[PDB]
Amino acid sequence: MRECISIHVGQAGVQIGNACWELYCLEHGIQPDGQMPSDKTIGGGDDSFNTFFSETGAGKHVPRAVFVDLEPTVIDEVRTGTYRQLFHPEQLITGKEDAANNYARGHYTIGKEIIDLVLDRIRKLADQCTGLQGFLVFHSFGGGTGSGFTSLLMERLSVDYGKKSKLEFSIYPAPQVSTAVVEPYNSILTTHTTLEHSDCAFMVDNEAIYDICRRNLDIERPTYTNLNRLISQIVSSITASLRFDGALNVDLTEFQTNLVPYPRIHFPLATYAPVISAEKAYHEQLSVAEITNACFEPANQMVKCDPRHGKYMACCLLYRGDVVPKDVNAAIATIKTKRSIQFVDWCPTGFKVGINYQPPTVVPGGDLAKVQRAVCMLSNTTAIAEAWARLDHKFDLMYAKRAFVHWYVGEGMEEGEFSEAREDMAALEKDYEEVGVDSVE
Amino acid sequence: DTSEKVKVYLRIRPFLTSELDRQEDQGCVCIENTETLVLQAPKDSFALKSNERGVGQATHKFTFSQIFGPEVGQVAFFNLTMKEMVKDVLKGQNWLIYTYGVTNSGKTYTIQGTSKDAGILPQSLALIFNSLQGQLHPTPDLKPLLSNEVIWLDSKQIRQEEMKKLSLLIGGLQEEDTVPVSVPADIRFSVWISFFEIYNELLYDLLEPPSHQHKRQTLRLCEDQNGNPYVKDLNWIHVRDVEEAWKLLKVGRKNQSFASTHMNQQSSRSHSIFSIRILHLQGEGDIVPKISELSLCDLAGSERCKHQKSGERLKEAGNINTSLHTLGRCIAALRQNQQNRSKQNLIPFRDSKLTRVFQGFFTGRGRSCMIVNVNPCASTYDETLHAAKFSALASQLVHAPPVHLGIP
Amino acid sequence: MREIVHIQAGQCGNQIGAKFWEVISDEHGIDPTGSYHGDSDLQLERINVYYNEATGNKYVPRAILVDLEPGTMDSVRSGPFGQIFRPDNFVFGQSGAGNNWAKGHYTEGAELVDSVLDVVRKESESCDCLQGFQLTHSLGGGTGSGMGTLLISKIREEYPDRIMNTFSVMPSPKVSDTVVEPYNATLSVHQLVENTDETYCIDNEALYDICFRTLKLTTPTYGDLNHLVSATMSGVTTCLRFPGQLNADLRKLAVNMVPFPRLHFFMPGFAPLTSRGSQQYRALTVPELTQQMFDSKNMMAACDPRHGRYLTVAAIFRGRMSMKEVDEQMLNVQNKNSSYFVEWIPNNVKTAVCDIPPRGLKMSATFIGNSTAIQELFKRISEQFTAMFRRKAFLHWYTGEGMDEMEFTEAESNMNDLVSEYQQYQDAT
Ligand SMILES: CC(=O)O[C@H]1C(=O)[C@@]2(C)[C@H]([C@H](OC(=O)c3ccccc3)[C@]3(O)C[C@H](OC(=O)[C@H](O)[C@@H](NC(=O)c4ccccc4)c4ccccc4)C(C)=C1C3(C)C)[C@]1(OC(C)=O)CO[C@@H]1C[C@@H]2O
Ligand SMILES: Nc1nc2c(ncn2[C@@H]2O[C@H](COP(=O)(O)OP(=O)(O)OP(=O)(O)O)[C@@H](O)[C@H]2O)c(=O)[nH]1
Ligand SMILES: Nc1nc2c(ncn2[C@@H]2O[C@H](COP(=O)(O)OP(=O)(O)O)[C@@H](O)[C@H]2O)c(=O)[nH]1
Ligand SMILES: [Mg+2]
């Protein structure tokens, strides 16, 4: 079977999970109470596909998920909201006290006595999986539980399982906007987790998605419910090939093999091209060429950076809907013609293409318009280094004067680890600078 | 000053036969010179050569005032480091000895320990007493309670102190210089000793025997007439010969708190301060004769809290870490208080009990010195690195060209 | 679950506590008898942050009244919300301090601290997981300052890892109703800096200025000042009791507001605040709340931020609103007033959002500022202190209770050091 397990850590994780599971339930026709009318109506097929759901005797479908907050206020909304009967009661709240935006608390002192329960639940979920595997970890840098507990969880997972893909969806800090003062310490102390144990990590930024909502969907005052919906669309586009038939399928192994050149380079950038409002859904053809061109615009990126300042090392285009390979090939040829898009010499092909027949679904109340075709582009580029470098500068401004360090030190953490983390980041940045250099004969 | 800095001193313990057979001398530590050390991780076959994300060498250079290898003996180590400082103390000035280390670093062997291979403590004590031999007052008549004030004793108080020290010595009793005299026959030298600790930012005495399970010795930190700080209600004991003082410190260390760790070992969980005060009283004597204080501070080694995350120890571990961090900041300020920089900075000594007790010596009423003992074995390499980062004058990254694997 | 134990000492502390409990009971739909007569379900979701449940669905707050002398007892118990409190928590004595810190700390309060500690231990042991304690009192007084400092010391000795939060009413420079304010204020400030996690500074001059210039009230009383302080207290811990898009608590606010251990003296503020007749002439939006919060005339500390720099600020918004607007407004405030923010913190503003607003409003916001200008309020006090200590103005009253002169001088030095510790960061570097 073709199965994945979703972990969501922290408040950002829980809310993104809410949006994602809403989208999956609408895609597969599953009611909020777990029942499917369509399965009884038809009497055939596996519409409650095993990629994200498990079927019990009475026709109920349980998500293959577990999320943890260390703060009951977030998950207790799930226990009371419309999806209270969908999830298993094992949504592991243990928030007698939260991490207080402290990496050390989430990683060392309060992260324990909760990790055992999480590992037991994950083991129980994995034992039910007689087939393919891959973890999908949603979280946020800048928080305590989203950084420390994620670090501990991935450290334990890499030993318990080892040879299983562990995809990451992280809420990276914005260049200017923020909601905390101790954000850079937590963000830089997560480097070890996202380097050693992760196999592929996608980073997204709140400023970029705010810009996308403001400019494309004409939303003047967006909130996190739109950001989570867009991230859910991206995730569904990634994993569509495991669920629905298509002309060209792309498993997670195919996805990683054609996008990760070297082991230390697994930080691609994500883009959804046909983001458009209902009013602007008209006045536009929305053909394959237009969406493929829109994927490459700097303005549509989900991270605040500029691919024109770097070099593309590999791209994965995943199409859904009324799409044909011929127009896709024409679009890739047109993209290769342009000289504003630069490709490294050591990757002459530089494109992986996957096509799926199922078109995207529209969530009622959402601000995305129904469309016939869509594309998700996932491209590994050196410009992402910029998004790190700025953050590093901020960290330095707080570490020269030793500000806020006593909170981390008093919760069981050596000072030197700070320096170690920074050095690790520097090394990674240097690597991204060196792969982009043209070959010398 | 002639660029005093703080005069850190690094000591490397010799390898043991019981550990060399286990392949612990992996070239991790080696002395580039008497001022510089280089630290290298256990890479290649010493660790897992697989993966190794940018850990090809991981070389770090550290600068020290002086580095003492295993070739230096106990007496040789003491003579070249503390003999000048013992002379300075007997002149009339005060001094301190910070000591930092971890299990197997040999700090307990370096400062105190075997009577034959005398440490810094017994050697300094012997030099001090042999120096003033024949200049001891016949009886105690004066208490160095405060750093600049005195308390007079009557006959009954003297007898009470005699009973106190006799009861302390008899209980828990087991088996475990003059030529350059400053001024004999004009000034009598009287020696008093005290010993206490900081534990969870609470002060606790150690000369008091195990009176009860509860440690109701929460000494308060007051300030004198001039504002100088001082521990209130601390016991002090007069000493007549080196053996009495040494034995009293063995009793005090016996009382000292200890706790297990994540191996089958035991270690201290407190910052223990030992103080010896010499009263110089001339024939006139006047009031509060001159006072000279030599202090030693054994600091709890900074230890990671992941492996130790079981039980309430974690709490005190965090406290220990916090205290040491504050101490480092103070030293950094004292390394900037040097005229080297003109901006200057305030010394945040009030942020912790340990720094506050040592206020006069960051203010400029005394001089301080630090020792760091390191285990050269590879299995403790990370710990050694942390110790270097605590105590190094400066650090350098050679940038290690073989690092950055994966990429061609 | 995270529970808060509330302590209040002195006349000012007791009155602020009474108004604050009235406000919270109205917020959670609690009648004076104790029963719950609310409408929304969320009100009972986290009611046990403040209340304990009795037999017949009656809720009793976790309030301890330290020195409820009969003068304040008869006012509190006979008030509209007097029967709600548990009788056993009313600890009291006779022959109070009488504006004498020595009596409160050493002579009289020392005989009564044991009962208060017994009640505090009984309350704390009855909780699932304690977040921290909360103290309300006034410096410049008698039993309040002295026994509040003594209780803080004993509590932090017993419960070191928990949060110690205090709302202290500082003595104003001009609006003074006691002669020996400087002595008690200096000793209390010496005691607070070593034994509290976060302390909010309140001045009566600032609250009178708010009542006159902003709310346009002609005859303000202490009820209105208690009202404003209670609004601040409710707004600080809103996210502990209700859900929201971005949550926070006392520990998270502390970690983002105290760069160094000794710098934990905050200036609070609240928005919106406008007169009854002028509410129809202005639209309630996030920019208006931000503008009113960051204005210098709205602060309750009686210190102008323009004379110093903001080490770090926190804003807790209440109401349904957009995150983009909040973030944009905070970034705009930081960029336009770059002179009033320390350079070595790239981002000074912490933001939190709670969904449920107050009962009668559409949106609201609470501001906690940490700036160097707070040192001003100490400096004035220190000046007055030395003007009384150079000649021993009223010193024999304190020494007659067994308290040496050195304890005065030490306090001065510590307070002066705190001022110096705040003076490092005002200079640009
Ligand atoms: C609509 C109208 O004409 O009256 C409103 C109102 O909008 C005004 C008059 C109110 C009014 O505020 C005052 O007059 C006032 C006087 C002294 C001290 C503090 C306030 C109001 O009293 C205050 C009151 O506030 C509340 O209802 C909140 O829930 C508030 N309640 C309490 O503090 C409270 C105290 C004791 C008993 C019950 C409730 C609150 C605020 C923060 C946290 C929790 C609760 C409101 C909306 C009004 C009136 C009634 C006139 C304002 O205050 C508040 C807190 O809303 C003053 O600035 C605002 C805006 C308005 O001018
Ligand atoms: N895009 C997006 N970001 C979110 C969302 N929720 C939270 N965040 C981000 O999360 C960051 C802070 O994380 P926290 O709110 O502290 O949550 P946490 O990581 O679990 O840490 P704790 O509060 O200790 O639980 C902020 O910078 C937000 O931008 C969301 O729903 N969507
Ligand atoms: N903000 C405010 N201050 C008050 C109130 N009542 C008294 N005060 C102030 O408290 C100070 C006197 O302290 P007091 O209450 O007598 O302390 P106590 O004697 O220990 O109870 C004066 O400076 C008053 O301005 C009040 O209701 N609100
Ligand atoms: Mg949280």
Short mmCIF file of C-alpha atoms in Angstrom, two decimals, chain C residues 14-362:
data_model
loop_
_atom_site.label_atom_id
_atom_site.label_comp_id
_atom_site.label_asym_id
_atom_site.label_seq_id
_atom_site.Cartn_x
_atom_site.Cartn_y
_atom_site.Cartn_z
CA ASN C 14 -7.47 45.19 48.85
CA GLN C 15 -9.39 47.81 46.87
CA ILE C 16 -7.65 46.93 43.60
CA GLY C 17 -8.37 43.28 44.35
CA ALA C 18 -12.05 43.97 44.94
CA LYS C 19 -12.42 45.86 41.66
CA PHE C 20 -10.36 43.25 39.78
CA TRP C 21 -12.48 40.38 41.09
CA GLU C 22 -15.63 42.29 40.14
CA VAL C 23 -14.23 42.67 36.61
CA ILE C 24 -13.23 39.02 36.29
CA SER C 25 -16.52 37.76 37.74
CA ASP C 26 -18.41 39.84 35.18
CA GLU C 27 -16.10 38.45 32.48
CA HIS C 28 -16.88 34.85 33.49
CA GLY C 29 -20.56 35.50 34.27
CA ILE C 30 -20.34 34.95 38.04
CA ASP C 31 -23.00 36.55 40.22
CA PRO C 32 -22.12 37.88 43.70
CA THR C 33 -23.50 34.69 45.25
CA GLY C 34 -21.00 32.62 43.23
CA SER C 35 -23.29 30.84 40.77
CA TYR C 36 -22.68 30.96 37.01
CA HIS C 37 -25.37 32.75 34.97
CA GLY C 38 -23.49 33.30 31.71
CA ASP C 39 -24.32 32.43 28.11
CA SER C 40 -21.20 31.35 26.20
CA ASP C 41 -19.69 27.91 26.71
CA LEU C 42 -16.09 29.16 26.55
CA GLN C 43 -16.52 31.01 29.87
CA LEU C 44 -16.32 27.73 31.84
CA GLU C 45 -13.59 26.22 29.65
CA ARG C 46 -10.76 27.69 31.77
CA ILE C 47 -12.60 29.14 34.76
CA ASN C 48 -10.37 27.20 37.16
CA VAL C 49 -7.40 29.44 36.32
CA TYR C 50 -8.77 31.74 39.06
CA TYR C 51 -11.61 29.87 40.83
CA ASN C 52 -12.06 26.68 42.82
CA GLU C 53 -15.29 24.70 42.51
CA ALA C 54 -17.43 24.17 45.61
CA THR C 55 -20.27 21.66 46.07
CA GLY C 56 -23.33 23.27 44.50
CA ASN C 57 -21.73 24.67 41.34
CA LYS C 58 -20.41 27.63 43.35
CA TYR C 59 -17.04 29.14 42.42
CA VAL C 60 -14.72 30.67 45.04
CA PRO C 61 -11.73 32.75 43.84
CA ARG C 62 -8.16 31.95 44.88
CA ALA C 63 -7.79 35.30 46.63
CA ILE C 64 -5.77 35.87 49.81
CA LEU C 65 -6.12 39.19 51.63
CA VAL C 66 -2.97 39.70 53.65
CA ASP C 67 -3.66 42.47 56.20
CA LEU C 68 -7.42 42.96 56.13
CA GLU C 69 -7.58 45.26 59.12
CA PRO C 70 -11.20 45.87 60.23
CA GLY C 71 -11.27 49.24 58.45
CA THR C 72 -10.66 47.49 55.12
CA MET C 73 -12.50 44.32 56.16
CA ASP C 74 -15.79 46.12 56.68
CA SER C 75 -15.43 47.79 53.28
CA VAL C 76 -14.56 44.61 51.37
CA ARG C 77 -16.93 42.10 52.97
CA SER C 78 -19.92 44.47 52.98
CA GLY C 79 -19.39 45.42 49.33
CA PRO C 80 -21.33 44.07 46.37
CA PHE C 81 -18.79 41.24 45.91
CA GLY C 82 -17.86 40.56 49.53
CA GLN C 83 -19.62 37.24 50.11
CA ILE C 84 -17.87 35.63 47.12
CA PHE C 85 -14.56 35.36 48.99
CA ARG C 86 -13.83 32.49 51.36
CA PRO C 87 -13.92 33.73 54.99
CA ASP C 88 -10.83 31.76 56.03
CA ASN C 89 -8.63 33.61 53.52
CA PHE C 90 -9.21 36.93 55.35
CA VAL C 91 -5.98 37.10 57.36
CA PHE C 92 -5.87 40.12 59.63
CA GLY C 93 -4.34 41.74 62.69
CA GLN C 94 -4.66 44.76 64.98
CA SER C 95 -2.50 47.87 65.41
CA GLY C 96 -1.19 48.00 61.86
CA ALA C 97 2.20 49.28 60.72
CA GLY C 98 1.12 52.91 60.42
CA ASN C 99 3.27 53.91 57.43
CA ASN C 100 6.33 52.18 58.89
CA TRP C 101 8.26 49.64 56.82
CA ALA C 102 10.05 48.31 59.91
CA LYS C 103 6.76 47.39 61.59
CA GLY C 104 5.52 45.65 58.46
CA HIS C 105 8.72 43.70 57.81
CA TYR C 106 10.16 42.90 61.26
CA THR C 107 7.89 43.59 64.25
CA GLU C 108 4.19 43.20 63.40
CA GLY C 109 4.17 41.38 60.06
CA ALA C 110 6.60 38.75 61.32
CA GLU C 111 3.93 37.59 63.79
CA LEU C 112 1.31 37.22 61.01
CA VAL C 113 3.31 35.87 58.05
CA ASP C 114 2.99 32.27 59.26
CA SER C 115 -0.80 32.19 58.90
CA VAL C 116 -0.60 33.74 55.43
CA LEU C 117 2.00 31.17 54.38
CA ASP C 118 -0.19 28.37 55.74
CA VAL C 119 -3.14 29.60 53.68
CA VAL C 120 -0.93 30.02 50.60
CA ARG C 121 0.41 26.48 50.96
CA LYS C 122 -3.13 25.13 51.38
CA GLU C 123 -4.27 26.95 48.23
CA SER C 124 -1.23 25.98 46.14
CA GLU C 125 -1.39 22.31 47.15
CA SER C 126 -5.02 22.23 45.94
CA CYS C 127 -3.97 23.06 42.34
CA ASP C 128 -3.15 20.77 39.44
CA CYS C 129 -0.20 22.75 38.06
CA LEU C 130 0.63 26.25 39.25
CA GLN C 131 1.77 28.88 36.76
CA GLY C 132 2.71 31.52 39.31
CA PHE C 133 1.59 33.91 42.00
CA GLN C 134 0.15 37.41 41.68
CA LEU C 135 0.62 40.23 44.20
CA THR C 136 -1.07 43.62 44.40
CA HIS C 137 0.11 46.22 46.91
CA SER C 138 1.34 49.80 47.25
CA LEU C 139 4.80 51.07 48.09
CA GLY C 140 5.13 54.10 50.31
CA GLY C 141 2.66 52.57 52.77
CA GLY C 142 2.98 50.42 55.87
CA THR C 143 1.76 46.83 56.09
CA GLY C 144 1.47 46.73 52.29
CA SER C 145 5.10 47.31 51.31
CA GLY C 146 6.71 45.54 54.26
CA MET C 147 4.63 42.40 54.50
CA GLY C 148 4.32 42.16 50.72
CA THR C 149 8.10 42.08 50.46
CA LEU C 150 8.28 39.54 53.29
CA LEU C 151 5.66 37.36 51.59
CA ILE C 152 7.51 37.61 48.27
CA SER C 153 10.73 36.48 49.95
CA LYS C 154 9.10 33.53 51.72
CA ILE C 155 7.10 32.46 48.66
CA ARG C 156 10.12 32.52 46.36
CA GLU C 157 12.07 30.54 48.95
CA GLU C 158 9.31 27.91 49.04
CA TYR C 159 8.36 27.97 45.32
CA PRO C 160 11.45 29.09 43.37
CA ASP C 161 10.64 27.76 39.90
CA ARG C 162 7.20 29.40 39.59
CA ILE C 163 6.41 32.91 38.35
CA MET C 164 6.25 35.82 40.82
CA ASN C 165 4.20 38.65 39.31
CA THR C 166 3.52 41.96 41.08
CA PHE C 167 1.45 45.08 40.35
CA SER C 168 3.11 47.75 42.50
CA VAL C 169 1.65 51.24 42.97
CA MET C 170 4.69 53.51 43.07
CA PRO C 171 4.67 56.81 45.00
CA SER C 172 4.03 59.76 42.73
CA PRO C 173 6.41 62.76 42.79
CA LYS C 174 3.76 65.48 43.17
CA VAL C 175 0.60 63.64 44.28
CA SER C 176 1.79 62.61 47.75
CA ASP C 177 -0.34 61.86 50.82
CA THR C 178 2.38 60.48 53.13
CA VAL C 179 5.60 62.00 54.41
CA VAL C 180 7.78 58.86 54.72
CA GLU C 181 7.19 57.56 51.19
CA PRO C 182 10.90 57.60 50.17
CA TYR C 183 12.10 55.26 52.93
CA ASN C 184 9.47 52.58 52.34
CA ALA C 185 9.75 52.92 48.56
CA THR C 186 13.54 52.52 48.63
CA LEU C 187 13.46 49.48 50.91
CA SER C 188 10.68 47.87 48.87
CA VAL C 189 12.52 48.48 45.59
CA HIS C 190 15.59 46.88 47.17
CA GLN C 191 13.50 43.84 48.12
CA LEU C 192 11.63 43.48 44.81
CA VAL C 193 14.55 43.36 42.37
CA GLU C 194 16.00 40.16 43.86
CA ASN C 195 12.73 38.23 44.35
CA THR C 196 10.29 38.85 41.46
CA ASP C 197 10.09 37.73 37.84
CA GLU C 198 8.10 40.66 36.43
CA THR C 199 6.85 43.83 38.12
CA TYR C 200 4.51 46.45 36.65
CA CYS C 201 4.93 50.02 37.90
CA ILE C 202 1.75 52.05 38.46
CA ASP C 203 1.66 55.73 39.41
CA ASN C 204 -1.41 57.65 40.53
CA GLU C 205 -0.41 60.79 38.62
CA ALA C 206 -0.55 58.90 35.32
CA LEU C 207 -3.98 57.47 36.12
CA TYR C 208 -5.30 60.90 37.10
CA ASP C 209 -3.92 62.28 33.82
CA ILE C 210 -5.71 59.50 31.94
CA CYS C 211 -8.96 60.28 33.76
CA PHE C 212 -8.72 64.01 33.03
CA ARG C 213 -7.28 64.30 29.53
CA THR C 214 -8.55 61.09 27.88
CA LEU C 215 -11.82 60.08 29.60
CA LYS C 216 -12.79 63.72 30.38
CA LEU C 217 -14.07 62.85 33.86
CA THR C 218 -14.56 65.85 36.14
CA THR C 219 -14.51 64.20 39.60
CA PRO C 220 -12.46 60.99 39.40
CA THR C 221 -12.26 58.75 42.45
CA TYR C 222 -10.15 55.74 43.39
CA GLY C 223 -12.78 53.52 41.77
CA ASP C 224 -11.75 54.68 38.30
CA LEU C 225 -8.05 54.11 38.97
CA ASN C 226 -8.87 50.64 40.27
CA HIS C 227 -10.96 50.15 37.12
CA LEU C 228 -8.02 50.93 34.84
CA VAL C 229 -5.61 48.73 36.82
CA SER C 230 -8.15 45.89 36.77
CA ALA C 231 -8.52 46.24 33.01
CA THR C 232 -4.74 45.94 32.67
CA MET C 233 -4.63 42.89 34.95
CA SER C 234 -7.38 41.17 32.97
CA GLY C 235 -5.68 42.03 29.68
CA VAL C 236 -2.31 40.61 30.72
CA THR C 237 -3.57 37.01 31.18
CA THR C 238 -6.34 36.93 28.56
CA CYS C 239 -4.64 34.21 26.50
CA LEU C 240 -4.41 31.89 29.52
CA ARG C 241 -8.21 31.63 29.77
CA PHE C 242 -9.46 31.88 26.15
CA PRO C 243 -8.31 30.53 22.77
CA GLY C 244 -6.75 32.61 20.03
CA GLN C 245 -4.76 32.64 16.83
CA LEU C 246 -1.43 33.23 18.62
CA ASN C 247 -1.33 32.36 22.31
CA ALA C 248 0.88 33.61 25.13
CA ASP C 249 1.18 33.34 28.90
CA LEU C 250 3.08 34.95 31.77
CA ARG C 251 6.23 32.91 31.14
CA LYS C 252 6.21 33.64 27.41
CA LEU C 253 5.77 37.36 28.07
CA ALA C 254 8.60 37.25 30.61
CA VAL C 255 11.04 35.45 28.30
CA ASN C 256 10.40 38.02 25.55
CA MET C 257 10.55 41.07 27.88
CA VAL C 258 13.53 40.63 30.27
CA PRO C 259 16.84 40.54 28.34
CA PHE C 260 18.75 40.43 31.65
CA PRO C 261 17.53 39.20 35.04
CA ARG C 262 17.43 42.57 36.84
CA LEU C 263 15.59 44.47 34.06
CA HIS C 264 11.99 43.48 34.86
CA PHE C 265 10.26 46.80 35.63
CA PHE C 266 7.49 47.40 33.09
CA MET C 267 5.13 50.24 32.23
CA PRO C 268 1.57 49.03 31.44
CA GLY C 269 -1.05 50.59 29.22
CA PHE C 270 -4.50 49.84 27.84
CA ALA C 271 -6.52 50.80 24.76
CA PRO C 272 -9.12 51.94 23.73
CA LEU C 273 -9.98 54.64 26.29
CA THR C 274 -12.28 57.51 25.31
CA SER C 275 -15.03 59.62 26.81
CA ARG C 276 -18.67 58.58 26.61
CA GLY C 277 -19.65 61.34 24.17
CA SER C 278 -16.60 60.97 21.89
CA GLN C 279 -16.90 57.25 21.09
CA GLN C 280 -19.21 57.89 18.12
CA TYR C 281 -16.63 60.09 16.33
CA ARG C 282 -13.91 57.47 15.75
CA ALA C 283 -13.82 54.02 14.16
CA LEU C 284 -12.31 51.17 16.18
CA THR C 285 -9.48 49.65 14.13
CA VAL C 286 -6.07 48.15 14.82
CA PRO C 287 -4.16 51.33 13.78
CA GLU C 288 -6.13 53.38 16.32
CA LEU C 289 -5.34 50.91 19.11
CA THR C 290 -1.65 50.86 18.19
CA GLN C 291 -1.51 54.67 18.03
CA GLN C 292 -3.18 55.01 21.43
CA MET C 293 -0.96 52.36 23.03
CA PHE C 294 2.35 53.78 21.83
CA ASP C 295 1.32 57.34 22.76
CA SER C 296 3.27 58.73 25.70
CA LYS C 297 0.18 60.18 27.42
CA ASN C 298 -1.55 56.78 27.82
CA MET C 299 1.13 55.08 29.93
CA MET C 300 0.35 54.41 33.59
CA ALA C 301 3.98 54.71 34.76
CA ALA C 302 4.37 58.52 34.74
CA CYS C 303 7.56 58.21 32.68
CA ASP C 304 7.90 59.55 29.15
CA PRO C 305 9.38 56.95 26.74
CA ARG C 306 10.75 59.75 24.54
CA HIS C 307 13.41 60.42 27.20
CA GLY C 308 14.75 56.87 26.77
CA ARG C 309 14.68 53.76 24.58
CA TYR C 310 12.36 50.76 24.46
CA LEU C 311 14.35 47.69 25.44
CA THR C 312 11.35 45.53 24.56
CA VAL C 313 7.55 45.79 24.32
CA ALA C 314 4.65 43.35 24.22
CA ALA C 315 1.13 43.78 22.84
CA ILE C 316 -1.78 41.46 23.60
CA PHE C 317 -4.73 42.14 21.30
CA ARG C 318 -8.26 40.93 22.01
CA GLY C 319 -10.83 40.58 19.25
CA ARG C 320 -11.33 39.16 15.77
CA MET C 321 -8.72 40.82 13.57
CA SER C 322 -6.20 40.18 10.80
CA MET C 323 -2.64 39.15 11.58
CA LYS C 324 -1.27 41.08 8.58
CA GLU C 325 -2.64 44.37 9.91
CA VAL C 326 -1.12 43.77 13.35
CA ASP C 327 2.30 42.84 11.98
CA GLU C 328 2.31 45.74 9.50
CA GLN C 329 1.37 48.25 12.20
CA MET C 330 4.06 47.03 14.60
CA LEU C 331 6.68 47.12 11.84
CA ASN C 332 5.54 50.64 10.89
CA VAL C 333 5.80 51.81 14.50
CA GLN C 334 9.29 50.34 14.77
CA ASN C 335 10.46 51.86 11.48
CA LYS C 336 8.98 55.35 11.92
CA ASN C 337 10.24 55.78 15.52
CA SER C 338 13.61 54.05 15.09
CA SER C 339 15.25 56.45 17.57
CA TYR C 340 13.27 54.93 20.48
CA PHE C 341 14.35 51.29 20.06
CA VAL C 342 17.60 49.56 21.00
CA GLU C 343 19.69 48.58 17.99
CA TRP C 344 20.96 45.26 19.41
CA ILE C 345 17.46 43.69 19.33
CA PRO C 346 16.38 43.41 15.66
CA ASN C 347 12.71 43.03 16.64
CA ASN C 348 11.46 44.43 19.95
CA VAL C 349 7.68 43.87 19.72
CA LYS C 350 6.07 40.65 20.91
CA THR C 351 2.53 40.10 19.61
CA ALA C 352 -0.29 37.91 20.89
CA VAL C 353 -3.91 37.66 19.75
CA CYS C 354 -6.97 36.36 21.62
CA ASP C 355 -10.30 35.74 19.91
CA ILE C 356 -12.74 36.65 22.71
CA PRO C 357 -12.91 40.42 23.36
CA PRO C 358 -14.27 42.03 26.53
CA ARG C 359 -18.01 41.96 27.06
CA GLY C 360 -18.93 45.36 25.62
CA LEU C 361 -16.16 46.07 23.10
CA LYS C 362 -15.27 44.99 19.57
#
